[PDB]
Design a protein around this motif. Structure first.
Motif, PDB file in Angstrom:
ATOM      1  N   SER A  95       0.870  -1.182   0.000  1.00 49.50           N
ATOM      2  CA  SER A  95       0.000   0.000   0.000  1.00 49.50           C
ATOM      3  C   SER A  95       0.906   1.230   0.000  1.00 49.50           C
ATOM      4  N   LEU A  96       1.479   1.552  -1.156  1.00 49.17           N
ATOM      5  CA  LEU A  96       2.365   2.708  -1.185  1.00 49.17           C
ATOM      6  C   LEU A  96       1.625   4.035  -1.059  1.00 49.17           C
ATOM      7  N   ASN A 119      -9.986   7.518  -1.321  1.00 44.90           N
ATOM      8  CA  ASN A 119      -8.707   8.228  -1.294  1.00 44.90           C
ATOM      9  C   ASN A 119      -8.510   9.027  -0.008  1.00 44.90           C
ATOM     10  N   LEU A 120      -9.121   8.574   1.086  1.00 42.20           N
ATOM     11  CA  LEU A 120      -8.992   9.203   2.400  1.00 42.20           C
ATOM     12  C   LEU A 120      -9.489  10.642   2.416  1.00 42.20           C
ATOM     13  N   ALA A 180      -7.901   5.364  -4.867  1.00 46.74           N
ATOM     14  CA  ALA A 180      -7.610   4.433  -3.786  1.00 46.74           C
ATOM     15  C   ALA A 180      -8.876   4.241  -2.964  1.00 46.74           C
ATOM     16  N   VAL A 181      -9.384   3.015  -2.945  1.00 45.15           N
ATOM     17  CA  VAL A 181     -10.613   2.680  -2.239  1.00 45.15           C
ATOM     18  C   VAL A 181     -10.255   1.906  -0.982  1.00 45.15           C
ATOM     19  N   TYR A 182     -10.759   2.376   0.156  1.00 41.96           N
ATOM     20  CA  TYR A 182     -10.572   1.730   1.445  1.00 41.96           C
ATOM     21  C   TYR A 182     -11.928   1.318   2.002  1.00 41.96           C
ATOM     22  N   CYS A 183     -11.953   0.222   2.757  1.00 43.63           N
ATOM     23  CA  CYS A 183     -13.092  -0.114   3.601  1.00 43.63           C
ATOM     24  C   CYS A 183     -12.627   0.029   5.043  1.00 43.63           C
ATOM     25  N   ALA A 208      -7.689  -0.597  -2.740  1.00 47.71           N
ATOM     26  CA  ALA A 208      -7.925  -1.091  -4.087  1.00 47.71           C
ATOM     27  C   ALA A 208      -7.763   0.051  -5.083  1.00 47.71           C
ATOM     28  N   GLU A 209      -7.375  -0.303  -6.305  1.00 48.15           N
ATOM     29  CA  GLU A 209      -7.002   0.658  -7.337  1.00 48.15           C
ATOM     30  C   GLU A 209      -8.093   0.747  -8.395  1.00 48.15           C
ATOM     31  N   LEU A 210      -8.506   1.972  -8.724  1.00 51.65           N
ATOM     32  CA  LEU A 210      -9.536   2.205  -9.731  1.00 51.65           C
ATOM     33  C   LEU A 210      -8.962   3.006 -10.890  1.00 51.65           C
ATOM     34  N   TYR A 211      -9.081   2.462 -12.099  1.00 49.61           N
ATOM     35  CA  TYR A 211      -8.608   3.115 -13.313  1.00 49.61           C
ATOM     36  C   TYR A 211      -9.775   3.318 -14.269  1.00 49.61           C
ATOM     37  N   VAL A 212     -10.174   4.572 -14.459  1.00 43.99           N
ATOM     38  CA  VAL A 212     -11.172   4.943 -15.455  1.00 43.99           C
ATOM     39  C   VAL A 212     -10.480   5.812 -16.489  1.00 43.99           C
ATOM     40  N   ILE A 213     -10.509   5.369 -17.743  1.00 38.41           N
ATOM     41  CA  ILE A 213      -9.739   5.987 -18.809  1.00 38.41           C
ATOM     42  C   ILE A 213     -10.690   6.422 -19.913  1.00 38.41           C
ATOM     43  N   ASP A 214     -10.376   7.568 -20.516  1.00 38.14           N
ATOM     44  CA  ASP A 214     -11.137   8.073 -21.655  1.00 38.14           C
ATOM     45  C   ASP A 214     -10.793   7.190 -22.845  1.00 38.14           C
ATOM     46  N   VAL A 215     -11.634   6.179 -23.075  1.00 38.29           N
ATOM     47  CA  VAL A 215     -11.372   5.202 -24.123  1.00 38.29           C
ATOM     48  C   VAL A 215     -11.832   5.686 -25.490  1.00 38.29           C
TER      49      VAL A 215
END
Ligand code: NI
Ligand code: NI
Lengths: 140, 308, 260
Positions: A111-112, B135-136, B173-176, B187-194
């Motif tokens: 978790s960087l 993302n806190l 950055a998603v936290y529970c 967890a990592e979220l990637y939304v890209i202009d496709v």
């Protein structure tokens, strides 16, 4: 030889400079510094840092953490932290007093993002406190 | 007598499950079944032994922060074969907080969901107390929350907006969190202009097709290969641009203006060409809205000649 | 073998040893490919084949340099124009840093490190230090490692905070004051530095050629100013720049033009 008032003023200017640096990391200003995050308890976050030896060991740990974060800004800033410790060494020499001198890697891979954002906002809080107490006769 | 299975490896599937894989005997001219004896040193330690014809085994709902020691033996499927000796035990360890999925890469406006399993001092807290955090910075609203079960928490994002970069980072950055108590893993979220507008143009001699596209969006993800995929069918474009799954890649070259260009030569003049852009990341593969073309319709005219 | 060296400069170490002395050496002006002096000690009028070399080298290197506006990279420039005659030797920059500030005497602390530098089309070698201690003492010089040995430029030290380049002040707005007809000017200070700043403001009527009048603000707390203008209904182009109030730095670039 060493002007103590000059060193104190340069110390204040450097602290405010570091504060502006932390102000430039857009993602860190919106993260609660005081919010507790489990796993990063070894980082010397908000816990009354009321003495020169505690301040020194706190900044030393923060430097050790920053050395592992791969961002250029925070690394040179860790270099600035070196300058800050040397300034505190000159101040302790001014007041006469001796100053003596693991799991981070695992969180660094898993978790960087959390480690940098937290380390930085808690650092900003610790330094803001240090600033509020670098005039009420800091003691060794 | 068969040899012991080798190549003992354990991996964690996307569904948060354990897959054990081992290498079968290629030298064996006979089918082999394999007994896998696996023990979990979790808060509850248990042992089990199964028999599988294939080289892979799946165990559902892995427990966080648990050890797993696995041994495998092999036996001939047909005849009175003798069970081989057990393989060298292999140990796999889990972590604090479990995610479903670990990561997502998607496009704008999609409906992407998530689930978390939070561990708080060996206590799987109720999903009613699990709080999703972006993302806190801002807490996810409760309306988007969901209760898969008392222990499994869920959230969902409809009409996904483009992941606006914050610093060098290209993923939310998603936290529970256990109410105000938040762990360090995320967890990592990637939304890209496709949405890519491919601009193809035809030479004046009807011999080559120069196609351009600016991947201005993509210069944020590293470790992901970018390429152009296409497929051509006999004539013309069906009104719905779609991929006959058989596709081939076209090598294309960067330009000084930052565009990626590449040329098709020679050409099938009356034939339907469908193409799109493929982005292969470790997460998976993303494809632009496919577009088709007839070359003859995209020809730039030559200047009128012999003018007096 | 051009002119006889005077006897006054000669000396008798012994009946067997001869001596010559050159006090207050002047620059050995290069002739042909021979930057040195080809000394011959000879048996009176005519000579043996043996020959020796004397080098006077203008190693006084003016190393001048600048910290970026973010205090995140610093770059130093020096022109090796003098050394543009010698081959076979090596030229480099050698620097020693110690913890804080510069000792009053710029001198080579025996431990030192080399600095890689790149020649530019301008005829200057530039060396970029990054990362950055803001308050460390960096002395440096130019080392010439020749087959003879090592020559060194006059060492000079630096504290980076002194050579910070001020960013131009941002968000400058010029307006016409109501009911008074004055020019009201506002600005936002650059994020750096923390020192008090003096401010210079150039202003004039809008046009292809602009007469630049100047006003100076001496107190850093003043974030705004007001001035008299002859024309109350013409566009005015104004730019602002900032310097450290103590002056231990540079003058910032003129801010973006503001049009009334
Ligand atoms: Ni077909
Ligand atoms: Ni020393």
């Amino acid at each position: 030889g060493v002007p103590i008032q000059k060193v104190q003023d340069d110390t204040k200017t450097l602290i405010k400079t570091i504060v502006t640096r932390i102000n430039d990391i857009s993602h860190t200003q919106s993260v609660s510094a005081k919010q507790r995050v489990t796993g990063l308890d070894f980082i010397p976050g908000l816990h009354p840092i009321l003495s020169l030896s505690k301040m020194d060991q706190t900044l030393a740990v923060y430097q050790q953490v920053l050395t592992s974060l791969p961002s250029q800004n925070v690394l040179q800033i860790a270099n600035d932290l070196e300058n800050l410790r040397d300034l505190l060494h000159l101040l302790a020499f001014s007041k006469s007093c001796s100053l003596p001198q693991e799991s981070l890697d695992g969180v660094l891979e898993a978790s960087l993002y959390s480690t940098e954002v937290v380390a930085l906002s808690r650092l900003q809080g610790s330094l803001q406190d240090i600033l509020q107490q670098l005039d009420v006769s800091p003691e060794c | 007598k068969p040899d012991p299975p080798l190549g003992l490896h354990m991996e964690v599937t996307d569904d948060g499950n354990l897959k054990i894989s081992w290498d079968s005997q290629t030298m064996a001219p006979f089918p082999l079944q394999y007994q896998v004896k696996y023990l979990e040193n979790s808060t509850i330690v248990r042992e089990a032994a199964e028999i599988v014809s294939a080289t892979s085994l799946l165990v559902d709902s892995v427990l966080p922060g648990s050890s797993y020691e696995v041994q495998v033996r092999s036996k001939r499927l047909d005849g009175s074969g003798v069970w081989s000796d057990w393989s060298s035990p292999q140990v796999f360890t889990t972590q604090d907080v479990v995610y479903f999925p670990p990561k997502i890469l998607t496009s704008v406006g999609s409906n992407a969901s998530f689930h978390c399993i939070y561990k708080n001092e060996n206590q799987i807290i109720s999903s009613k107390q699990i709080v999703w955090w972006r993302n806190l910075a801002e807490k996810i609203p409760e309306i988007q929350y969901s209760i898969v079960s008392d222990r499994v928490s869920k959230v969902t994002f409809s009409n996904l907006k483009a992941t606006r970069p914050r610093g060098k980072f290209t993923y939310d950055a998603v936290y529970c969190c256990n109410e105000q108590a938040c762990h360090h893993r995320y967890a990592e979220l990637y939304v890209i202009d496709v949405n890519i507008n491919i601009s193809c143009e035809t030479d004046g001699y009807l011999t080559k097709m120069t196609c351009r596209w600016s991947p201005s969006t993509i210069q944020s993800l590293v470790g992901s290969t970018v390429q152009l995929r296409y497929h051509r069918r006999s004539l013309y474009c069906p009104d719905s641009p779609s991929i006959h799954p058989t596709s081939e890649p076209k090598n294309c070259v960067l330009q000084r203006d930052g565009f990626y260009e590449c040329v098709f030569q020679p050409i099938f003049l009356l034939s339907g060409y469908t193409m799109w852009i493929r982005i292969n990341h470790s997460l998976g593969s993303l494809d632009s809205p496919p577009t088709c073309v007839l070359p003859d319709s995209v020809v730039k005219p030559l200047p009128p000649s012999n003018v007096k | 073998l051009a002119e006889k060296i005077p006897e006054i400069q000669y000396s008798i170490v012994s009946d067997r040893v001869s001596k010559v002395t050159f006090s207050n050496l002047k620059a050995t002006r290069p002739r042909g490919k021979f930057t040195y002096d080809a000394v011959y000690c000879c048996n009176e009028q005519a000579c043996h084949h043996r020959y020796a070399e004397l080098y006077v080298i203008d190693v006084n290197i003016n190393i001048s340099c600048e910290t970026d506006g973010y205090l995140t990279k610093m770059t130093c420039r020096w022109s090796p124009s003098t050394i543009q005659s010698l081959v076979g030797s090596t030229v480099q920059l050698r620097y020693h840093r110690r913890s804080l500030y510069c000792p009053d005497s710029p001198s080579i602390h025996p431990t030192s490190e080399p600095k890689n530098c790149v020649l530019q089309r301008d005829g200057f070698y530039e060396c970029v230090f990054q990362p950055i201690f803001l308050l460390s003492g960096y002395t440096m010089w130019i080392r010439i490692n020749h087959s003879l040995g090592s020559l060194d430029s006059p060492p000079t030290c630096v504290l980076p905070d002194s050579v910070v380049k001020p960013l131009p002040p941002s968000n400058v707005k010029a307006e016409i004051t109501v009911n008074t007809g004055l020019l009201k000017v506002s600005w936002e200070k650059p994020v750096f530095p923390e020192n008090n700043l003096q401010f210079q403001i150039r202003y004039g009527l809008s046009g292809k050629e602009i007469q630049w009048k100047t006003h100076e603000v001496f107190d850093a707390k003043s974030k705004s100013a007001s001035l008299l203008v002859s024309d109350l209904c013409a566009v005015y182009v104004v730019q602002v720049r900032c310097r450290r109030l103590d002056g231990l730095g540079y003058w910032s670039n003129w801010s973006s033009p503001a049009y009334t």
